[PDB]
Symmetry: C2
Subunit: 779 residues, 2 copies
């Protein structure tokens, strides 16, 4: 057509595919804190000159709030540029705290490195700096999380031996990150609501093994809810006696996180060193730990890292004293207790186990202590009767070890004979299985923290925390039934976190040709994932049921100061097809004040900037287009053109010359003479972003409703978290927009999307967002 701006020739369905593809790269940021400005300048220069990385240094020559505003307003526009961004922070922790800088980093989907306590020649500091240059545009610190345990090994990218290649499972890794963030969000909910620690229990709807680890990394305990529990096939009252069949410390973590979910109080026999426990948060736990190798230092180090109360005893455990007053067990009078016995001996092992067995058969029946679970290593060459045996299981990461695990329980079999030949044949079979099938037997231990019941009918009193997705959204539950349950959950002030495929995003991705019918099919909202049937849900359906979408980014930034999960490296198209939702009562209670963790900053400009770059849209021209879209809408509503003057700038869409009104189902929009109207630009931008990734739009709209007037900043928040919004002399968050300015934006949203994407937008996506906005502003 030979004109600019040009959407007609630059945006087609293949451009849209490429935008989807670019969305896998939307987390380019590293935030790197250190105390040595000349060191920062050197590695800034080295990485930008060698790899093109965009580098910023917040060094304190500008006031911290203005530096953050300038730096991250710029970065917000560049997140779809497919170039790494590194912000070095060299001001002292007194100028901007670790927790604040971490919150900002994760709100922008970045990696976070805090090394400001290091001296200039720290070998760790120099190493992490040199890693910037070596790996750019990648970096080996995860985004939005301290740790990572998937198959990607960055050192393998440097080795000729390994062909300078490594593993990359974006979808699987982002799904683990998501489980982690959802757990971290519940932990942040518990902490904000001041829930007592023994009540920090979350119900996982549908069995989902990684949550045991993520929960215990956050100091909460999981329980699984299953409709029907299959019988494992083995012996005993629950069929767990011989049922039918990359953390380096995962063998210890598998058992210990499970065992830690059964009781706030633990007898740990053979505990030294228990290094894997140092990564967990165990505030509210008490650990009585027996080992001769234990020292006073190991005790204090263990309580300092985990927050648990640790009683460290430098003795062998006394298996011959059948007293509740022996082995210091006194502390657990009138309490719950579980017992992790890790002990073993290389000689007379069969005898040692017999005496332990007799002891545990006694211990599980105490009346002054409510003993929940006891685990013991089992390796027996003879036939042996056992009482109170609930389970006899293989070790899921035991590999080819010949050892089983026995679990004692009040509700076990009263008596059973364990034939050594059957166990030996069982271990023959188990050790002969692939590593995966071995690992997937952890489902046998998790049976013991699974409840049977219909999640739709569960008791939601007392602020109960629940995490639910497929087991609620699958075809077997009607949408009508799920939405009533959710509406009732929000009514009860429960915390059911709900996730589901987003109907209109998925239909869009198929429409432009990204997703093939071979991979995923849908009929209306009924979805068939290839390699099960699911119901998609939309934002307006859920808002009517009292639920507000929140992004994974927002959840982890919100949870940043309690978060202890994993991060991620790549974004994933498949995960982006899903949306997550939290109850409106919690949003109104705690999220109407938009600090950076709760803001759409990392989505509100990067798609617009990408499209302006592609389509040759100058900065001012963009605002002229917005004026022109408002002009066309006002004419379509038969407003006399003499009543308004289109300006089309960034601060003035139009000026009102004489009073007029536009009819609208959320109360007539009213424009008074001699006023300037500045419609809400961020609504238009979020409606574009909502075509490609999960959207913070509904949460943003609720904050926009709240922000018709100045609002005092919350007292207990660091005010630097509000850097991205204007604050008044009086110290209040300054008003944003009138309801007229928001709803007018909602009214032209469809025309704006048609403009920006060359009429290849999704009318259905815009429509569901418009409905939700209209309900937000309902009169």
């Amino acid at each position: 057509d030979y004109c600019i701006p040009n959407f007609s020739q630059t945006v087609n369905e293949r451009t849209i595919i490429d935008i989807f593809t670019i969305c896998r790269y939307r987390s380019p940021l590293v935030v790197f804190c250190l105390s040595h400005n000349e060191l920062a300048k050197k590695y800034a220069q080295d990485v930008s000159m060698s790899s093109g990385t965009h580098v910023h240094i917040i060094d304190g020559s500008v006031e911290i709030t203005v530096s953050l505003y300038r730096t991250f307003r710029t970065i917000a526009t560049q997140l779809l540029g497919r170039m790494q961004i590194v912000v070095f922070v060299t001001v002292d922790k007194s100028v901007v705290s670790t927790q604040v800088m971490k919150s900002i980093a994760w709100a922008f989907r970045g990696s976070f490195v805090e090394l400001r306590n290091q001296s200039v020649d720290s070998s760790t500091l120099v190493s992490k700096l040199e890693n910037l240059v070596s790996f750019a545009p990648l970096y080996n610190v995860p985004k939005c999380g301290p740790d990572y345990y998937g198959p990607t090994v960055y050192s393998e990218l440097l080795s000729l031996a390994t062909n300078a290649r490594t593993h990359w499972y974006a979808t699987i890794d982002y799904s683990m990150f998501t489980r982690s963030v959802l757990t971290g969000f519940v932990a942040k909910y518990f902490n904000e609501e001041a829930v007592p620690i023994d009540k920090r229990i979350v119900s996982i709807v549908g069995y989902n093994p990684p949550y045991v680890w993520t929960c215990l990394r956050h100091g909460i305990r999981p329980t699984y809810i299953e409709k029907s529990l299959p019988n494992p096939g083995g012996k005993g009252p629950f069929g767990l006696i011989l049922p039918v069949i990359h953390n380096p410390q995962i063998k210890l973590l598998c058992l210990d996180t499970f065992m830690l979910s059964t009781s706030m109080n633990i007898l740990y026999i053979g505990a030294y060193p228990a290094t894997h426990l140092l990564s967990l948060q165990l505030n509210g736990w008490t650990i009585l730990a027996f080992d001769p190798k234990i020292t006073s230092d190991w005790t204090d180090a263990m309580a300092k890292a985990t927050g648990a109360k640790v009683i460290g005893v430098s003795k062998e455990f006394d298996f011959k004293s059948f007293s509740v007053q022996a082995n210091q067990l006194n502390m657990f009078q009138n309490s719950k207790l579980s017992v992790i016995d890790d002990t073993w001996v290389e000689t007379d092992y069969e005898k040692f186990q017999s005496e332990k067995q007799a002891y545990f058969e006694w211990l599980i029946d105490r009346t002054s202590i409510d003993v929940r679970l006891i685990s013991m290593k089992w390796n027996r060459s003879k036939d042996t009767s056992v009482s109170h045996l609930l389970a006899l299981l293989p070790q899921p990461y035991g590999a080819s070890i010949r050892e089983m695990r026995a679990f004692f329980h009040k509700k076990g079999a009263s008596d059973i004979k364990i034939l050594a030949a059957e166990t030996e044949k069982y271990m023959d079979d188990f050790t002969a299985m692939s590593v995966s099938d071995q690992i997937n037997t952890q489902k046998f231990m998790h049976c013991m923290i699974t409840t049977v019941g219909d999640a739709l009918k569960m008791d939601l009193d007392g602020g109960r925390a629940v995490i639910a997705s497929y087991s609620l959204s699958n075809s077997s539950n009607s949408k009508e039934r799920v939405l009533k349950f959710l509406s009732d959950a929000n009514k009860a002030k429960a915390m059911v976190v709900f996730g589901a495929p987003n109907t209109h995003r998925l239909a869009y991705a198929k429409k432009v040709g990204l997703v093939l019918d071979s991979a995923i099919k849908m009929s209306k909202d009924l979805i068939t994932f290839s390699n099960w049937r699911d119901y998609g849900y939309s934002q307006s359906e859920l808002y009517d049921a009292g639920y507000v979408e929140i992004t994974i980014d927002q959840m982890v930034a919100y949870s940043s100061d309690v978060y202890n999960g994993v991060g991620y490296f790549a974004n994933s198209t498949y995960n982006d097809l899903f949306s997550w939702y939290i109850p409106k009562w919690y949003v109104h209670k705690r999220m109407l004040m938009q600090d950076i963790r709760l803001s759409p900053a990392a989505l509100v400009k990067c798609f617009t900037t990408l499209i302006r770059n592609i389509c040759y849209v100058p900065h001012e021209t963009y605002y002229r287009f917005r004026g022109i879209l408002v002009d066309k809408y006002l004419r379509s509503k038969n407003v006399d053109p003499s009543q308004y003057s289109i300006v089309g700038s960034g601060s003035k869409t139009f000026t009102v010359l004489s009073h007029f009104e536009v009819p609208h189902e959320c109360g007539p929009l009213v424009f008074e003479a001699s006023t300037d109207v500045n419609i809400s630009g961020h609504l238009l931008s979020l409606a574009i972003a909502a075509h490609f990734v999960a959207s913070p739009m509904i949460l943003w709209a609720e904050q926009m409703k709240y922000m018709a007037v100045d609002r005092m900043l919350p007292p207990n928040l660091d005010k630097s978290l509000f850097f991205d919004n204007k604050v008044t002399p009086s110290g209040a968050l300054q008003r944003w927009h009138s309801r007229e300015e928001v709803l007018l934006a909602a009214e032209i949203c469809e025309s704006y999307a048609a403009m920006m994407l060359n009429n290849k937008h999704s009318p259905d996506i815009i429509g569901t967002l418009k409905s939700a906005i209209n309900l937000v502003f309902k009169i």
Copy 2:
């Protein structure tokens, strides 16, 4: 680890034919840079923050906190990797002109395909300075100053982008505008060549092979004179000896530029009567011309100003011309004895108009037959209501940029008709025809004016002695062209050659970018939409003694004499063409690689884009290079125990014992206990040559020169060498051995296959490889 789909780096899932299409598309955006010089650093920081925060533009400030050479090195090594990022980049320069001069900074800017703004020494409140600064924010990611050129005159009007009246849109004709930019650059290159060769001003004449109207303007903008060469002349169909009496049928200055640029082609000496104001002439370079200007409106300031701006020697006389005094010692025509002279007459009259014209025309009939002055051509306005006979007149022509005027133009000449009567009813019927036509066909009347500076003949037969300058493409049989080019290089002539690049075009067709409906090709014979021509390759031209140079390089090399137009968008169509200059000039003047002659604006940006897409870490990239050399040495049956692969940025491998690799430019010889670091820039230039014209041949010749340290040329600002290592002696440090270069050429095909997931072009690599082997011929 078997499925590469779940491994990084990853080329198998990330690079398909559609990825290749998108790289072609991104090349249209490969000129993001603005260089803005101003003397006020807080002002620069304000607009840096504003453009960065609002549009994401990447901003640098060179403020003199760091030494200028290191600052240029840090800023432009960074920028070089980012040129395909599709985000605007702005370098603010606030040091003084004595730290980095205007001409140097302009050279660097244009080498990186940037716009250049010089506004240092303007006051902090200058309205022009503020306006241009505000334009950065308003227009980002676009900018309204052209790239690689001060001026622009095409359909794009940036102010229309801010107008609700104009729907906030404007015209965008990338190919047409980039073709005009290219004509302008080629002219500028020839003007730079004349200056470096110290050609006498009056010999600064270029032959344009094939009629090409815009070159008259571009040549006069650069103080050089055009002549066209055509195989055949269609008969003008008019009266007079040559048929030029009545032939058959966005510069605001264009009406006056049209005649005056032509007239300035005929003679280094001009008598201009009725000259005031002559504003349009201030845009020309006229050094070596002489202008005797007669007008009562002329003052002392006007003469001083015209000489300042054009460089011409200007003698302005505040009288009316004495048209009645038929003496060469009258109107100061004294100064023109034994000289060539043309006359431009703009004097009109409202009363006694025909009477005034017969007064002049009887003076020009006397002047045109002189003998102590060589009078070449005289132009005057023609508007006669009754019949006049006239002597010594070659052409009576209409004004091509005459919209609907009644007046015409008459040109006197020695070889014009001796006597001819001009009847009023003929010319009245003629002008009614002229007024009737569209303006598009009206302006094309230029062809009759341009006949007077056209010679007929076979361009391949032309006399090439004397360093003769020629611009030649389409109007220039493949074997015959290459022989003539070969002979032109042997003769040390300056024939500048351009042609479609066979293998780039074939690649663009094969991945699906350009359709068989727009451009067809059979081997190297191309059918455009209809006309046909041959594609040429870089090895074919090197064999004929010619070296590819890019348009970017030509304009940066010529920056200190350039006075042409810039551009805004790059163009896929134009990028299908390559331009070439004779090897003798390359060896004489281009073997020392300052930034203007460097591949810096293409050697990194494609590699970086691919590494971002394909998840290739910086150090992993050098490991891949080591692996590629490992695979190559084994396929040559070199025993692995003779070398040890390192694969870092500075050591590809270590030689354990002496070995040799057979090579047509070799053997390649490797001595025990030495480190080998192959040329990385050869590999990345080979990728870049898939998509745009290539500096690879010029680079290779410079690389051959750089096997040892080389002292910098003394007449050049040393800051132009910022991008390469310079010794404390003041020498350009050596780069690579011939082994390290040729090893890279040897693995180049496997490198392209790796980076592009086997969707590269073996023929592009092959023609580059063959040309490099010829550069390094033993």
